[PDB]
Amino acid sequence: SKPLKGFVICCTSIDLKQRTEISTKATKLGAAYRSDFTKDVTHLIAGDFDTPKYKFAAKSRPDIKIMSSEWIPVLYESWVQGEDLDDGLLVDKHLLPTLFKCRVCLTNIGQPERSRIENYVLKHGGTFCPDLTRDVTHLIAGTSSGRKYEYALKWKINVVCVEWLWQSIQRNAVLEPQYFQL
């Protein structure tokens, strides 16, 4: 019984102790573990979207599933506890949210588009930020002007158009900001 036979797993921005735990448990579960992001990788466990590995998956690997750090610890525990494991192997439950760790602020966008954007941000696992603070990862700007725009630039926050959001949602992964500049 190798529940994860055929699974090839790679990790990105994972704590050393947790990554060692994941490599061990995934191997015991029957998966192939990869240190480097090799061609045969089927699943990428990610702790952040700001890594060459995550950026490669988002840009060039739409066949791979981007997973939460909890997937392997949770599935392994369930397995060794004698709990029942379905055909799913808790993949759907532990899929990393599309906008994982995104803190999205808006400027110069009117209503009802502002409400629409907020709802899609929350739906796809992001944090909606009415106020611009230095912890905002993305500022969706309607025009390249105003106080939010000026401070986001000073605070080195990504200033993107709304297509960053819509293309990230369609890809089901965080995409890079350089293609969505105003």
Binding site: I109, Q111, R114, D131, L132, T133, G142, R147, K148
Partner: peptide, 14 residues
């Protein structure tokens, strides 16, 4: 606010 640019009031939205 300090390190903060508050949300634009609805009446001032384009």
């Amino acid at each position: 606010g300090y390190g903060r640019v508050e949300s634009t009031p609805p009446a001032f939205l384009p």
